[model samples]
Target chain A: PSSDQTWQPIDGRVALIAPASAIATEVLEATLRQLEVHGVDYHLGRHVEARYRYLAGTVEQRLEDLHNAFDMPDITAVWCLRGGYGCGQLLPGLDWGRLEAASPRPLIGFSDISVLLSAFHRHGLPAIHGPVATGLGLQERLASLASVSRLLAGIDHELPVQHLGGHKQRVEGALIGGNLTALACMAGTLGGLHAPAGSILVLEDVGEPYYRLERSLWQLLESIDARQLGAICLGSFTDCPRKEVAHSLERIFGEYAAAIEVPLYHHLPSGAGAQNRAWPYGKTAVLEGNRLRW
Target chain B: SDQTWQPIDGRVALIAPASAIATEVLEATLRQLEVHGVDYHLGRHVEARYRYLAGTVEQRLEDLHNAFDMPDITAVWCLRGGYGCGQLLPGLDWGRLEAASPRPLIGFSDISVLLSAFHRHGLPAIHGPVATGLGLEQQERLASLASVSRLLAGIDHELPVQHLGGHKQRVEGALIGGNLTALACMAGTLGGLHAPAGSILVLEDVGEPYYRLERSLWQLLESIDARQLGAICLGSFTDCPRKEVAHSLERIFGEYAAAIEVPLYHHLPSGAGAQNRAWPYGKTAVLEGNRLRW
Candidate 1:
């Protein structure tokens, strides 16, 4: 029940679940190779290759995959292949209480996987908002993987944090937040996670127009208790629609950061490559002068 | 200043100098008024110039000021509409707007800016039927107009009534809100009206792309305490562009509707005058179902 609680390696294997799409399959294989290279033991969840249009399976199927992964005795962690638009459809059907009670292992993924991360946080479980299995090919994959390893080894890495220029000083707190649209989709629901008091919240998104991004950000600002957060961390808001509108994402972020009295930082640690780094959520970290570090 | 009811026929004035349809529709609407035995007067400034907004900003503001200045003219009615009120808001002189002009003003859609400005200046305005709105054939529109008039005249009406797509519960709070985009633009500006805590927020818009509509809603939601909201009354979200990937208004509603404690209601209120509905801003009223009762 405490935010300070951390999970230790359990006596079980890990479960890998990939989107059923072709791209996801290739990504899943790449991810499995990486896991093998890292010398970790894991097993594939049922229907990992199940397909529905742009999703792993029907809503019921995806829910079953999630529930089964959590129930598997040998599976200590659940990692997803890639994130897309369909994660939200399976949210209502999943057994949240059972997942919370039975196998509370570290869940990880980013992008579309933000849906699950937010839900986990809402349920008071620490989840990782990091690269998915499909992100194994990212240029920064090694660094991200190393970081994950350090996290699993219970070692705090004191790496020099870099900040996008014009960022304010950093603050430290438990981290919670991810993909803007996914966070927005969960707004006002029991599944929507709020920033725990004195926590640092990070937000990121891809392929959204500036206005749309602003809307999602606004949803967070409006629905959550903005004043309780220790600080705000902004990551890559990539592929925004180029427009002449003055209210761009940067301007909007600046306005909110200033209004809410939270230190705000923007960082694009990983470019639009396959090897994007992974970020761990629900962990206390230092946001010193806009630099994020463990 | 009599406390008793007065059959003051000249208390409200209908003024339009923009489109020729304003006069035609006004006449037709006035005919309906005659049939309904509702007494009202046409303002001295009633004349269509065959242009979009009855007249120039100055002319419209002058009419507004004149209507307020008159001892008898209590409410100013906009005639025939097009997209021009955005131009009129800045032109109106608030200093000369007669602080004692405690009368209800009404219109919708293109007239959104005026409603916002009126509320901003601490005056009550309606987003209900206009003279041209009277041309609408729907009984709902006529009935809505009748209900609005009765409310303005201090008659108590039961509201939070049920309608297509959702049910509404009585929400009594100071009314504040109008066309989505107009309301959004007013954010962070001195001219914006703040909906008091625990207020019911009404929103309507027209011809907006799905993303744009969502952005506006998100901005409003983010800018306010949505959890503290007494209720949300959604009016017609008309003429959205058809798109294969577009999220419909209903979907957008579903995303946040469950997040708040209040009930959410959607309706296409009568007023064929695209995006027409009278909303009383800066006053306490009850919104239940698709009806507003003061």
Candidate 2:
């Protein structure tokens, strides 16, 4: 089923669905072209181009498209168009049991889509914490696309990270977490993140300032069993404004990790950063020195 | 000796439990408090700074503990609210505080976390301007500050609101909730809100865009038993930019409230920038046509 290893590939056709905020037509075209360039066969969701307010479509429409994708026997992966604000809206209406009854394809995307990725993982399915389809359209984001393609092609790789704090001893656990804001917002909800004991939690975000990020960290940690975490990994906090405070983002994150006595590492080359490397969600991995290897 | 539902007695413990505050601002606020014939005792670490927080969590927690322990202090009034209250939640000596003659905790903005926690512990929590907020001299600001004094003296007042959604009948419930962002950030944590059945949720925020505000409201609703509320009341969404988004903040808030099938009201005349007149939180209130009375 390709459930929990980065080396496991999406061997069949991919279904691209937009369960989040609206994406531009040009970006979608560019993304399709990119997929074709990579020799990847894809089926587009019927409502991928639909826009209702900030969402790609109503919850009903989005949910229908998602279910239809999973129902297809040929589909091996369900990729997301983007991760803006609407993905969390579809969680309640989601037919998790139906998806489980159908094929066991891995769902892909980051940011707002973090909700679904975590949900899929909670339901014991494979998911990828990686770039949305639209992100592949950008020239600067081609590296991210390449990384996603490599993972989908079953190539094993170790992701290098910067050690921020804690003892630099080797630790192994399941990898989980995505956007800090989305996961934190999911706290206390049906879709709240479930970090298993000995899981290495990864986080990233965009547009939120330092205080907001700090607030989310506090909530996310408080909501989950922090004492059970094997380690904490961080990606980019893109476009997050600083408040002339003495501490840098790394220092702030280090303080939080110090409170829980968890190993902390930064610069995982993913998230809203220029490099959104595809990483396995709910997959077992090892963190040693400054790199994560499956 | 629990101080739940107790009125303020002129003596106040002025503390900074959140972001750092300026010396001049503290001086101005203290002068105003003296003008109201209020006696004040400052927390020793009120001016201490650690990054964006007023002090280390331990320092802030010590002040909070001292505030409750001091017999002469009739109320604990927050000096400012940028962002730090939630950090002290886990370290809070709730047992010791509850053992003492607990005093009413007053403030808004980031202080909302403490307010909700106090309410959950059956303590008097006033949703009013902080000590720094009262330093302003505008007519409306003066009136707002005066209202705090009036409320502390056992005087009560009603607020005007316009019906936005659900049944328009007179609804009564315990008044709860404060800054939407703050409350939403507390979800899933020990400081998470404990809204009783039929509790009226009052939400407000500042400096957030429409999408961010909507996201926070969605989180709050999903995290708590929002459907159990008699109604949803909204105060001012001050400084929240709306031009970039398709839906107005009101429309977005309405959609969520409608989904929950609860009575919704707006224009409560309380918030970070507007006149934040004191509201007796953790107490019963009546919501009828055009007015919210306690």
Candidate 3:
């Protein structure tokens, strides 16, 4: 059931919502052009351009924007404006039971958007760790946008990702997380990760120094027991400067992998400044030597 | 029981639970201990290193266990602060240590996690200059080290602080918390502090950008519900550059305080590269404009 992406067909029904940070004008224009090319007639959320200090809007505004997007009859999918730092602040106030009972559409994003993706997963809905709506603006991010477009259109397939030090055999588990820092933040909150049995935790981060990054991962480990975990899919860690990688990211992660008994994989190309591949979370997937087949 | 502070009645035990330090740090600490008329024993774990870490998690935890379990070591002092304290938390014998007649554990920065961990189980700990610098000849550095020595044996008194926008009727509660990052990191771990009702959280951090720092405070706010707390004591945020004052630390904190509805006090002169004055955590304290008499 988790692997399938069957829903009411999304023809021109992608609703763009900015529940995190406000989008810039020219960037939004380019992004809309891309959406138009892809045949996605989007409903630009009213608050997408409203900036309140650092966030796109207030917590109440953001939550209402998100909840309203879900309640819309014309929309079949929701795409976030961008990832910043506002989504997690609003998690506890949402009507989770009523929202969960509502038929779920695929919600897409990464980075700070991890908070929303994980929340959706916790409520038994599958979403994608994909490019944000702004990814359509920067032509260099076209590949990222294309991946997201394909995924939302119900194409079931495996995209290539780096394989770091796990066994050569096939491994599978239900998806658990994205954006290490956000997941760590959510730990122990009422909405913390409810990792089902044999969940494969996916992790990525952006622009953190290695010391801060490693400490949060340790926090993530402590928050959820890993002996119950199946494997760790370490996605991209972009722009993390350091004095302590020893040699590289994998070598450092190797030390932790040895410390934790779970099989570990790394360098999976998915995060900001990387491939940012579109993939289903809250759903199980199979990983062999080369492909991550969902 | 939690309000007690055991000073240097001559027998001092030094510990290094994070990064490995040079023999020079040890010699400097030893000479200072002698100056303070304190006979000392060094934990062998202080000399060990696994790359950037002081030791493997197991080795580090063992040394801390033995130091605390020893009946003769009156005041346990940390050698320096670094990045491995959170790793030792999960493997620690917290139950045994809690059951043992508690002694004061001293250190700050990364050691803040230990202070909070001890607080979680009803142990008294101090936040002060650890066994770190030298300047046996330079008056300033010597004065700094002597300040540590003096406070290790002084009476409880209120220290002055910068009031960063909290309500003024004088908030009082059991003091808890350490490095802001560490406290945030421990949010969901076994060592994660469950701040009892009426607990005042003390926070400080070193060398983080404003965006990262803001995210962390938000994480801390979420991990332990800030709405239920008495107030937050902001110790010091050292070395975070101010050019980003557009998203400045104080302004960002002001935003969160508004959202969290928790009073935030700042500039209490404690953190890495700051006063780091020794104060007992888990002890009740009175707060006013002039002094934070604990």
The most accurate candidate by TM-score is: 2
lDDT of 2 by residue, B154-202 (tens): 7666888888856549889999998998888888888888799999999
Weakest ten-residue segment in model 3 chain A by summed lDDT: A1-10
Best by DockQ: 2
Question: What's the fnat for candidate 3, on a 0 to 1 scale?
Answer: 0.57
What is the docking quality class of candidate 1? incorrect
Off by over 4 Å in 1: A1-12, A17-60, A86-97, A122-124, A136-138, A141-170, A247-249, A268-275, B1-294
Q: After superposition, how far is residue B143 of candidate 3 from its true place, in Å?
A: 5.1
Q: Given the true complex, what DockQ would model 2 score?
A: 0.73
Best by lDDT: 2
Q: By TM-score, how accurate is candidate 1?
A: 0.55
Candidate 1 structure quality by residue, lDDT tens digits, A220-248? 66557777788766766677765654445
Judge candidate 2 against the unseen true structure and give its global Cα lDDT, from 0 to 1: 0.84
Encode model 3's per-residue lDDT on B1-294: one tens digit a residue: 112333466567787888778777678768856665677778878888777778788888878888877777767788877777877876888777876555678888788888887887777688777776541224333444555545556654667766676556687888888788777777777767658777788888888767668767877777776887777777778888765234667777777777768777787766766365667778888777766777
Fnat across every predicted model, in order? 0.00, 0.81, 0.57
